[PDB]
Design a binder for these strands. Structure first.
Length: 71
RNA sequence: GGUAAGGUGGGUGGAAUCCUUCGGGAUCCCACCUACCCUGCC
């Protein structure tokens, strides 16, 4: 699969970044997680119900800002 | 007992960029399978 997230778009348009996962909360049926990034020296964040959703949110923010575009 | 929703681990497969002595190296994503955790309905 070529991908399903804004993560791969960013990582193909302009790679050269770092990511930092952050802790979780809630019960197993309402669980949440978060994922942050450092791109071009900027910083971004994005929580979600799972690890992929977190990175998709944070990477979409990192993309739109650093790329001066939108998803 | 059956039915449905979400999360995590493990295994396998698929996919992209960068570098390369073309043997390889680095970065990175997804799906499937299996097990586990947990909630809703009847």
């Amino acid at each position: 699969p070529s991908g399903k997230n804004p993560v791969m778009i960013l990582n193909e348009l302009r790679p050269g970044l770092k990511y930092d996962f952050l802790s979780e909360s809630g019960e197993s049926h309402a669980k949440s997680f978060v994922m942050s990034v450092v791109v071009d020296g900027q910083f971004f964040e994005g929580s979600g119900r799972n690890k992929k959703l977190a990175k998709a949110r944070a990477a979409q923010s990192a993309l739109a800002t650093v790329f001066n575009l939108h998803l």
